[PDB]
C-alpha cells in the first residue's frame, strides 16, 4: 500500500498523464531520447534526467518514502527542462503550464 500522502500523489500523477493536460504534458511522458531528438549534448548538461514514466515506475515500485521525494522528482523534471532549453522555447511554456497543475495539486494535499 501507498501511504495516505502517496495515494494523493498517485492522483496528481494520474491527472498529469490525463487527456485534460495532454496538449502540454506530452513532452514529459517519456525519457528524453537525446539521440532521437538530436540533442546530443543533453546528458552533458542534465545529470539526472526525469520524466513522468519514470515517476510512474518509481511510484509502482514503492520507491518514494514520502510525498517530498515524489515532489522532488517532478520538480527535477521541470527544472531539467528549464535548465537545458532557451527560455523562449515552446517546450518551456508547456513545462510551465504543467508545473502550474503540479504545484497547485501538491499544495492542496490534505
Ligand atoms: Na489543503
Numbering used by the authors: 307 to 416
Task: Quote what the paper states about this structure.
Bromodomains (BRDs) are protein interaction modules that specifically recognize ε-N-lysine acetylation motifs, a key event in the reading process of epigenetic marks. The 61 BRDs in the human genome cluster into eight families based on structure/sequence similarity. Despite large sequence variations, all BRD modules share a conserved fold that comprises a left-handed bundle of four α helices (αZ, αA, αB, αC), linked by loop regions of variable length (ZA and BC loops), which line the Kac binding site and determine binding specificity. The four helices form a deep cavity that is extended by the two loop regions (ZA and BC loops), creating a largely hydrophobic Kac binding pocket.
The second BET BRDs bound to tetra-acetyl H4 peptides with about 10-fold weaker affinities, suggesting that the first BRD in BET proteins recognizes the H4 tail. In contrast, the second BRDs of BET BRDs bound either weakly (BRD2), not at all (BRD3), or promiscuously (BRD4) to histone sequences and their variants present in this array. For instance, recurrent t(15;19) chromosomal translocations that result in a fusion protein that comprises both BRD4 or BRD3 and the NUT (nuclear protein in testis) lead to an aggressive form of human squamous carcinoma (French, 2010a; French et al., 2001).
